[PDB]
DNA sequence: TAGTAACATAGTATACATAGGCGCTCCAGGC
């Protein structure tokens, strides 16, 4: 239903995701930074299987989830992006469909440039910088070795709309006028 | 770095310099975006200048640093009387302002100007009240920690002519995180104990 | 931070476009825990501009240019500065105070002594125009004075000296690569405390090799060497051995693999040589090693011209990290390469001082050529083998050739270090810098105008004056004023006895005697009037007196007997350098672009010199003595005697009579010639008598101005002329002289015709004033044609100032002799080339012998032509 | 001093008479052009009209959304100095949100300074 | 709203040159 529009400052102030269940909200923002390191990995070519395979230095890769060895692999998109708005910034992690929508090129296409044309790969990463979208983010807090780390997961990205966004901004500024 | 803030060139020029920090009144600004029309552009052998205008004050100069080797975007200089969006950080020199262009984009949908002005007013109000509320010896000093000592010993031990890479360093040391490896490597390279051979991921000690 | 902080500064740096008002200092600091000296960096902020405003006497309105009949005062000037200029040019904070100053310079319509308004404010504010005018003030001074000069003259720092800092601070983040850093708030806390001995430095000498690849037309680095000394004394004798550590690094350019069992051979020979994979590895290793060693002086040959630019270009192209380690300041954007005369190279090595032996050799001694082989041959006595660039690729087949190449590079570095130590450059540079007061890296760079300018600036600042502000802004040009005088010679041969008399430091003595200075002489081509003989000594006479008195002590040290020859040579070089510095101080008064340009001040000196020479000549001629020669300060007397004691007594009497007149001027005997051959003005040869006493004396050959000392004649002609002139001055009958000369000429002609002479005795050396591409008439210029061919063929990029050798070949194309010039390598390699004998017999030996033998009866030009067998008719 | 060197506030057809002898930018819906070409009429999207005059008759064919830079004269008319036609090939422009944006801007002019404010 | 990984996260323009003086021969080439 209606998106719980919340500024990241409010998100960190009320402590979203500290409960036993994750919390869902969506917002518009502009990408400021992306990490190209460790962004590419080999997934299990078996259908509906995305476990990371292990190279056996023989041209045949064995998957532990299916207990099966295959001579080929499928690339799968994993990405960490730095989201940022007028007030605060946050670190989010994407997946195949969301990163593919953001970048605009399928993973198998990227499978070629990293092997034959690094300059074109860098250009593809470059031209997608400083873009604005609407991201649905789910927040949950997990503890690892006695510190609580807030993680962000995004499952949907969409192009920005102006009509309802402008109406919402007008409504919010009118509301703050009374306060 | 922290957060982009929409603004207007009038506020940009009215801003003041305090201890390398530009403040428009009680508002801090580091990266800004502005949407406007280009009146005139001048072509330099390397750089490109633009005359942006948002009909709030006099036209402003924007400098875009492009390397002349990359003949990709310089040949696509935007023609005049076009409304564009500019994102970047400002610079100050001898009491005349300047803008450094991180990115230039022609604007396709033209409700974006009203959206941008609403962003400007709303963000200005919110952050202005956010700052309005109150309560807001000389020795060489040497010495290396145990972790950096282990890293240096691991680098030294390898006999490969090209030296070690990051994969072997991570494999040998499972007692500490990757970020600690990066920090130790950065410090060791800064102090000159190690040097890169071919790529940024290959290293080798200098003494041996 | 603990109270005070002592350190010894060496070099300074500033940047007025990015960090205005800050000055960096790099130097050494003593650490008690390790009992050693380590590098240190101190950075100074808050340097304020200084302006001087000159009040008027009547208030003149700008629009009308008339006087309004209103008296002026300091309050009016203050109000005019505050109300109008401050608001117009956006000046917020300032301090103002009246002061007293004196002006004695070129700007007209300024009183000699007046009251000025001193205004000081921070440097971040804008800069006022250099030609400001106002209602109440007519002129302003010191608008565009740099920060470094302001700091140096305010703190009275004269070259390297011990400094102390009061109440230091601690920087938030590192700035330099030094071990210890510090911060000073104001330039008031820095004080000079120099009364103790300087500390030792660390010296590194280095050289590398290059090769040109066929595919990529760029120069690569394939081998390097370096030698380091850790405790090089600065004022004592040169340590022996001059090096304590060394290293070498080698790598394969792009494709060729190292010969097999190279590593095993290296292990067997136990040589500390590092092998690399690619060029980037070599560059990274070199940068890490220089950072670890931390040298203070880097010495090499042709550093500024070729080596540094190639190194920086390869660092840029190979994308090596941390390029700033070659200096001492953390920087990321490298300055534009090449650019102007050494600006980028000097800026790249900030904090580290570069010593090029070529410039020092040019300044100190005189040679026929300035490549390393000639310097080794002359300064030392050894032979250096040269490896052609073509063979380099072929030496990548066997390990022995690679080891030989590395040994050759190491030997080259050792030769460079030995030459630098032998010439004794560092103590001389330190002494000159301490005398003048500039930055001693600029002293190592070269040039004579900057030293004099800084010396005069210090002298004027210390004496409460105002100095002129800086101006905004090839071959010898036309003369501007009358110079010296040369007497009419008396050509011929003299046999009885010749006496020579000469003044000591003529021009400094003139300046000191007649009290000639900027302040004293009143200037309105007309020679001004002499000063009134009741005033006091000016600044220039005192500076000249100090500089000329610094030389008498060195001469006194020279006069001591029982000295090793090398020490005598060093002392002679030092004394000559001091004399040249004094003469340059005189001559800078005529430089058009100088900061202290004044033409009459030198015309008066030259006029007095000519007058004194006239008076001396008349006085000597009055004593019934015959005068035959004189060159603007000297007199030749023909005593026409044989007894030596009579000549000595006559010279003593003449000296006593002449010295009786003047106050500071002195005369002396410069030599006694047993026999003299005079040809023209400034051209003669004689036997100088060296009195060893004990009933005997030794005669030594001397030449002045002949075509035997020039560098543009072949060696064969020079040798023949030397032999002939040696025969002429001998004590024999004239007929025997004629017969011996004829026999020698016939033998020379026969030998040259037979072609038995070596190839080496045919070269002609010339130098280029400009770049080889800037000569429109390259068709008829041989030394330009050969230079262009060398530049276009291979490398080494010969430029202005270098020497080009050439020979004349016979190409069988019936062209003129001037268009058939070829390099020696072309003659040796190509087969359709041979030495042109007729040209060498007709245009190189015949004119020299004819000119030398002109004043001797019995030998004529036609007889010379017939003797050589050059088709007599 | 040319007009592009001075601030130009965004004023709609509502307050034409309150900015007399003042530079002003206007945008909106083209309605009708006089046959002479020296002047035409404009719509603000609220049913009100505003007329614009030029010193020289217009030479090019105009259509769609247009903005005009000018000054309010004694007759509350706009002496245009320049104009730009707005694109309508891809996305419609909703003038109502623009109008309320002007209202909000006039409501809090302090956070949208006009000219150089010290 | 399963499946994914591993464990924190980055500065970059530019602008600014030095160089002591004059006097007295040599050569190459055209007129
Ligand atoms: N490189 C030089 C050499 C000489 N001179 C001028 C200025 C001197 O006053 C004059 C005489 O030079 P001398 O070589 O005779 O030297 P000094 O007389 O100055 O000194 P010394 O006593 O060593 O002969 O020539 C000069 O301007 N530049
Ligand atoms: Mg002399
Ligand atoms: Zn599987």
Short mmCIF file of N, CA, C and O in Angstrom, two decimals, chain C residues 358-443:
data_model
loop_
_atom_site.label_atom_id
_atom_site.label_comp_id
_atom_site.label_asym_id
_atom_site.label_seq_id
_atom_site.Cartn_x
_atom_site.Cartn_y
_atom_site.Cartn_z
N UNK C 358 78.18 19.88 -14.60
CA UNK C 358 78.44 20.61 -15.83
C UNK C 358 78.41 22.12 -15.61
O UNK C 358 79.30 22.84 -16.07
N UNK C 359 77.40 22.61 -14.89
CA UNK C 359 77.30 24.04 -14.64
C UNK C 359 78.45 24.52 -13.76
O UNK C 359 79.04 25.58 -14.01
N UNK C 360 78.79 23.74 -12.73
CA UNK C 360 79.90 24.12 -11.86
C UNK C 360 81.22 24.13 -12.63
O UNK C 360 82.05 25.02 -12.44
N UNK C 361 81.42 23.15 -13.51
CA UNK C 361 82.63 23.12 -14.32
C UNK C 361 82.68 24.31 -15.27
O UNK C 361 83.75 24.89 -15.49
N UNK C 362 81.54 24.68 -15.85
CA UNK C 362 81.50 25.87 -16.69
C UNK C 362 81.87 27.12 -15.90
O UNK C 362 82.59 27.99 -16.40
N UNK C 363 81.36 27.23 -14.67
CA UNK C 363 81.60 28.44 -13.88
C UNK C 363 83.04 28.52 -13.40
O UNK C 363 83.64 29.61 -13.39
N UNK C 364 83.63 27.39 -13.00
CA UNK C 364 84.91 27.42 -12.30
C UNK C 364 86.11 27.35 -13.24
O UNK C 364 87.07 28.12 -13.08
N UNK C 365 86.09 26.45 -14.21
CA UNK C 365 87.25 26.24 -15.08
C UNK C 365 86.88 26.49 -16.53
O UNK C 365 85.73 26.83 -16.84
N UNK C 366 87.85 26.33 -17.43
CA UNK C 366 87.64 26.51 -18.86
C UNK C 366 88.13 25.27 -19.59
O UNK C 366 89.28 24.84 -19.40
N UNK C 367 87.27 24.70 -20.44
CA UNK C 367 87.59 23.51 -21.21
C UNK C 367 87.16 23.71 -22.66
O UNK C 367 86.41 24.63 -22.98
N UNK C 368 87.65 22.84 -23.54
CA UNK C 368 87.25 22.89 -24.94
C UNK C 368 85.89 22.25 -25.18
O UNK C 368 85.22 22.60 -26.16
N UNK C 369 85.48 21.32 -24.32
CA UNK C 369 84.16 20.71 -24.41
C UNK C 369 83.75 20.25 -23.02
O UNK C 369 84.59 20.08 -22.14
N UNK C 370 82.45 20.06 -22.84
CA UNK C 370 81.90 19.83 -21.51
C UNK C 370 81.14 18.51 -21.39
O UNK C 370 80.26 18.37 -20.53
N UNK C 371 81.45 17.53 -22.24
CA UNK C 371 80.92 16.21 -21.97
C UNK C 371 81.81 15.49 -20.96
O UNK C 371 82.93 15.92 -20.65
N UNK C 372 81.30 14.37 -20.43
CA UNK C 372 81.97 13.72 -19.30
C UNK C 372 83.36 13.23 -19.65
O UNK C 372 84.26 13.24 -18.80
N UNK C 373 83.57 12.80 -20.90
CA UNK C 373 84.89 12.29 -21.28
C UNK C 373 85.95 13.37 -21.17
O UNK C 373 87.04 13.14 -20.63
N UNK C 374 85.65 14.58 -21.65
CA UNK C 374 86.61 15.67 -21.58
C UNK C 374 86.87 16.09 -20.14
O UNK C 374 88.02 16.36 -19.77
N UNK C 375 85.82 16.16 -19.32
CA UNK C 375 86.01 16.53 -17.92
C UNK C 375 86.87 15.51 -17.19
O UNK C 375 87.72 15.88 -16.38
N UNK C 376 86.66 14.22 -17.47
CA UNK C 376 87.50 13.19 -16.87
C UNK C 376 88.94 13.33 -17.35
O UNK C 376 89.89 13.20 -16.57
N UNK C 377 89.12 13.60 -18.65
CA UNK C 377 90.47 13.70 -19.20
C UNK C 377 91.23 14.89 -18.63
O UNK C 377 92.45 14.80 -18.43
N UNK C 378 90.55 16.00 -18.36
CA UNK C 378 91.23 17.21 -17.92
C UNK C 378 91.35 17.30 -16.40
O UNK C 378 92.46 17.40 -15.87
N UNK C 379 90.22 17.27 -15.69
CA UNK C 379 90.26 17.41 -14.23
C UNK C 379 91.02 16.25 -13.60
O UNK C 379 91.93 16.45 -12.78
N UNK C 380 90.67 15.03 -13.98
CA UNK C 380 91.43 13.85 -13.60
C UNK C 380 92.38 13.49 -14.73
O UNK C 380 92.49 14.20 -15.73
N UNK C 381 93.10 12.38 -14.57
CA UNK C 381 93.95 11.84 -15.63
C UNK C 381 93.60 10.36 -15.78
O UNK C 381 94.26 9.48 -15.23
N UNK C 382 92.54 10.09 -16.55
CA UNK C 382 92.06 8.74 -16.78
C UNK C 382 91.27 8.73 -18.08
O UNK C 382 90.83 9.77 -18.56
N UNK C 383 91.10 7.54 -18.63
CA UNK C 383 90.36 7.34 -19.88
C UNK C 383 89.04 6.66 -19.59
O UNK C 383 88.99 5.67 -18.84
N UNK C 384 87.96 7.17 -20.18
CA UNK C 384 86.63 6.60 -20.04
C UNK C 384 86.18 6.05 -21.39
O UNK C 384 86.20 6.76 -22.39
N UNK C 385 85.78 4.78 -21.40
CA UNK C 385 85.31 4.12 -22.61
C UNK C 385 83.83 4.42 -22.79
O UNK C 385 83.06 4.44 -21.82
N UNK C 386 83.42 4.65 -24.03
CA UNK C 386 82.05 5.03 -24.36
C UNK C 386 81.38 3.86 -25.08
O UNK C 386 81.96 3.28 -26.00
N UNK C 387 80.17 3.53 -24.65
CA UNK C 387 79.39 2.43 -25.24
C UNK C 387 78.36 3.04 -26.17
O UNK C 387 77.50 3.81 -25.71
N UNK C 388 78.40 2.74 -27.47
CA UNK C 388 77.38 3.27 -28.39
C UNK C 388 76.00 2.72 -28.08
O UNK C 388 75.85 1.61 -27.56
N UNK C 389 74.98 3.52 -28.40
CA UNK C 389 73.61 3.11 -28.13
C UNK C 389 73.18 1.92 -28.98
O UNK C 389 72.33 1.13 -28.56
N UNK C 390 73.75 1.79 -30.18
CA UNK C 390 73.32 0.72 -31.09
C UNK C 390 73.62 -0.66 -30.51
O UNK C 390 72.80 -1.58 -30.63
N UNK C 391 74.79 -0.82 -29.90
CA UNK C 391 75.20 -2.14 -29.43
C UNK C 391 74.39 -2.63 -28.24
O UNK C 391 74.43 -3.82 -27.93
N UNK C 392 73.64 -1.74 -27.57
CA UNK C 392 73.00 -2.08 -26.30
C UNK C 392 72.12 -3.31 -26.45
O UNK C 392 72.20 -4.25 -25.65
N UNK C 393 71.29 -3.34 -27.50
CA UNK C 393 70.42 -4.49 -27.72
C UNK C 393 71.23 -5.78 -27.83
O UNK C 393 70.88 -6.79 -27.21
N UNK C 394 72.34 -5.74 -28.57
CA UNK C 394 73.17 -6.92 -28.73
C UNK C 394 73.74 -7.39 -27.40
O UNK C 394 73.98 -8.59 -27.23
N UNK C 395 73.96 -6.47 -26.46
CA UNK C 395 74.47 -6.93 -25.16
C UNK C 395 73.43 -7.66 -24.34
O UNK C 395 73.72 -7.98 -23.19
N UNK C 396 72.23 -7.94 -24.85
CA UNK C 396 71.24 -8.71 -24.10
C UNK C 396 71.27 -10.19 -24.44
O UNK C 396 70.27 -10.89 -24.23
N UNK C 397 72.39 -10.69 -24.96
CA UNK C 397 72.51 -12.10 -25.32
C UNK C 397 73.29 -12.93 -24.32
O UNK C 397 72.99 -14.12 -24.15
N UNK C 398 74.28 -12.34 -23.65
CA UNK C 398 75.13 -13.07 -22.72
C UNK C 398 75.22 -12.29 -21.41
O UNK C 398 75.22 -11.06 -21.40
N UNK C 399 75.31 -13.03 -20.30
CA UNK C 399 75.32 -12.41 -18.98
C UNK C 399 76.55 -11.54 -18.76
O UNK C 399 76.48 -10.55 -18.03
N UNK C 400 77.68 -11.91 -19.36
CA UNK C 400 78.91 -11.15 -19.16
C UNK C 400 78.76 -9.72 -19.67
O UNK C 400 79.24 -8.77 -19.05
N UNK C 401 78.09 -9.55 -20.81
CA UNK C 401 77.87 -8.21 -21.34
C UNK C 401 76.99 -7.38 -20.41
O UNK C 401 77.24 -6.18 -20.21
N UNK C 402 75.96 -8.00 -19.83
CA UNK C 402 75.11 -7.29 -18.88
C UNK C 402 75.90 -6.86 -17.65
O UNK C 402 75.76 -5.73 -17.16
N UNK C 403 76.75 -7.76 -17.13
CA UNK C 403 77.58 -7.41 -15.98
C UNK C 403 78.54 -6.28 -16.33
O UNK C 403 78.79 -5.38 -15.51
N UNK C 404 79.11 -6.31 -17.54
CA UNK C 404 80.00 -5.24 -17.97
C UNK C 404 79.26 -3.91 -18.06
O UNK C 404 79.80 -2.87 -17.67
N UNK C 405 78.02 -3.93 -18.56
CA UNK C 405 77.22 -2.71 -18.61
C UNK C 405 76.98 -2.15 -17.22
O UNK C 405 77.10 -0.94 -16.99
N UNK C 406 76.62 -3.02 -16.27
CA UNK C 406 76.39 -2.56 -14.91
C UNK C 406 77.66 -1.99 -14.29
O UNK C 406 77.63 -0.96 -13.61
N UNK C 407 78.80 -2.65 -14.53
CA UNK C 407 80.07 -2.14 -14.02
C UNK C 407 80.39 -0.78 -14.62
O UNK C 407 80.92 0.10 -13.94
N UNK C 408 80.09 -0.60 -15.91
CA UNK C 408 80.32 0.69 -16.55
C UNK C 408 79.47 1.79 -15.93
O UNK C 408 79.94 2.91 -15.71
N UNK C 409 78.20 1.49 -15.64
CA UNK C 409 77.34 2.49 -15.00
C UNK C 409 77.86 2.84 -13.61
O UNK C 409 77.89 4.03 -13.22
N UNK C 410 78.28 1.84 -12.84
CA UNK C 410 78.84 2.10 -11.52
C UNK C 410 80.10 2.96 -11.62
O UNK C 410 80.30 3.89 -10.82
N UNK C 411 80.96 2.67 -12.60
CA UNK C 411 82.17 3.46 -12.79
C UNK C 411 81.83 4.90 -13.17
O UNK C 411 82.51 5.84 -12.74
N UNK C 412 80.79 5.09 -13.98
CA UNK C 412 80.36 6.44 -14.33
C UNK C 412 79.93 7.22 -13.09
O UNK C 412 80.31 8.39 -12.91
N UNK C 413 79.14 6.59 -12.22
CA UNK C 413 78.73 7.26 -11.00
C UNK C 413 79.93 7.60 -10.12
O UNK C 413 80.01 8.70 -9.55
N UNK C 414 80.88 6.67 -10.02
CA UNK C 414 82.08 6.93 -9.22
C UNK C 414 82.88 8.09 -9.79
O UNK C 414 83.41 8.91 -9.03
N UNK C 415 83.00 8.16 -11.11
CA UNK C 415 83.71 9.27 -11.74
C UNK C 415 83.03 10.60 -11.45
O UNK C 415 83.70 11.60 -11.18
N UNK C 416 81.70 10.63 -11.50
CA UNK C 416 80.98 11.87 -11.21
C UNK C 416 81.26 12.31 -9.78
O UNK C 416 81.55 13.49 -9.51
N UNK C 417 81.18 11.37 -8.83
CA UNK C 417 81.44 11.72 -7.43
C UNK C 417 82.87 12.20 -7.24
O UNK C 417 83.11 13.17 -6.50
N UNK C 418 83.84 11.54 -7.88
CA UNK C 418 85.23 11.95 -7.74
C UNK C 418 85.47 13.34 -8.30
O UNK C 418 86.20 14.14 -7.70
N UNK C 419 84.86 13.66 -9.45
CA UNK C 419 85.00 15.00 -10.02
C UNK C 419 84.41 16.03 -9.08
O UNK C 419 85.01 17.09 -8.83
N UNK C 420 83.22 15.76 -8.53
CA UNK C 420 82.59 16.71 -7.63
C UNK C 420 83.44 16.95 -6.39
O UNK C 420 83.56 18.09 -5.93
N UNK C 421 84.02 15.89 -5.83
CA UNK C 421 84.87 16.06 -4.66
C UNK C 421 86.16 16.80 -5.00
O UNK C 421 86.63 17.62 -4.21
N UNK C 422 86.74 16.51 -6.17
CA UNK C 422 88.00 17.14 -6.55
C UNK C 422 87.84 18.63 -6.80
O UNK C 422 88.70 19.42 -6.40
N UNK C 423 86.74 19.03 -7.45
CA UNK C 423 86.56 20.45 -7.75
C UNK C 423 86.32 21.29 -6.50
O UNK C 423 86.50 22.51 -6.56
N UNK C 424 85.91 20.67 -5.40
CA UNK C 424 85.60 21.37 -4.15
C UNK C 424 84.51 22.42 -4.37
O UNK C 424 84.72 23.63 -4.24
N UNK C 425 83.33 21.92 -4.72
CA UNK C 425 82.21 22.79 -5.07
C UNK C 425 81.39 23.17 -3.84
O UNK C 425 80.97 24.32 -3.71
N UNK C 426 81.14 22.22 -2.94
CA UNK C 426 80.25 22.50 -1.81
C UNK C 426 80.78 23.57 -0.86
O UNK C 426 80.01 24.48 -0.50
N UNK C 427 82.03 23.52 -0.38
CA UNK C 427 82.51 24.61 0.49
C UNK C 427 82.48 25.97 -0.19
O UNK C 427 82.14 26.97 0.45
N UNK C 428 82.84 26.03 -1.47
CA UNK C 428 82.81 27.29 -2.19
C UNK C 428 81.39 27.83 -2.30
O UNK C 428 81.15 29.03 -2.10
N UNK C 429 80.43 26.95 -2.61
CA UNK C 429 79.04 27.39 -2.70
C UNK C 429 78.54 27.88 -1.35
O UNK C 429 77.84 28.90 -1.27
N UNK C 430 78.89 27.18 -0.27
CA UNK C 430 78.46 27.61 1.06
C UNK C 430 79.06 28.97 1.41
O UNK C 430 78.36 29.84 1.95
N UNK C 431 80.34 29.17 1.12
CA UNK C 431 80.97 30.46 1.42
C UNK C 431 80.33 31.58 0.62
O UNK C 431 80.06 32.67 1.15
N UNK C 432 80.07 31.34 -0.67
CA UNK C 432 79.46 32.37 -1.51
C UNK C 432 78.07 32.71 -1.00
O UNK C 432 77.68 33.89 -0.93
N UNK C 433 77.28 31.69 -0.64
CA UNK C 433 75.94 31.94 -0.14
C UNK C 433 75.97 32.70 1.18
O UNK C 433 75.17 33.61 1.40
N UNK C 434 76.89 32.35 2.08
CA UNK C 434 76.99 33.08 3.34
C UNK C 434 77.43 34.52 3.12
O UNK C 434 77.02 35.41 3.87
N UNK C 435 78.25 34.77 2.10
CA UNK C 435 78.64 36.14 1.79
C UNK C 435 77.45 36.93 1.25
O UNK C 435 77.18 38.05 1.68
N UNK C 436 76.71 36.34 0.30
CA UNK C 436 75.63 37.07 -0.36
C UNK C 436 74.36 37.08 0.48
O UNK C 436 73.90 38.15 0.91
N UNK C 437 73.78 35.91 0.72
CA UNK C 437 72.60 35.83 1.56
C UNK C 437 71.37 35.24 0.90
O UNK C 437 70.27 35.30 1.46
N UNK C 438 71.53 34.67 -0.29
CA UNK C 438 70.41 34.08 -1.01
C UNK C 438 70.21 32.63 -0.56
O UNK C 438 70.83 32.16 0.40
N UNK C 439 69.34 31.91 -1.26
CA UNK C 439 69.15 30.48 -1.02
C UNK C 439 70.21 29.72 -1.80
O UNK C 439 70.39 29.95 -3.00
N UNK C 440 70.92 28.81 -1.12
CA UNK C 440 72.15 28.29 -1.71
C UNK C 440 71.87 27.31 -2.85
O UNK C 440 72.76 27.07 -3.68
N UNK C 441 70.65 26.78 -2.94
CA UNK C 441 70.28 26.01 -4.13
C UNK C 441 70.33 26.87 -5.38
O UNK C 441 70.80 26.42 -6.44
N UNK C 442 69.85 28.11 -5.29
CA UNK C 442 69.99 29.04 -6.40
C UNK C 442 71.46 29.33 -6.70
O UNK C 442 71.82 29.56 -7.86
N UNK C 443 72.30 29.34 -5.67
CA UNK C 443 73.74 29.50 -5.90
C UNK C 443 74.29 28.33 -6.71
O UNK C 443 75.08 28.53 -7.64
#
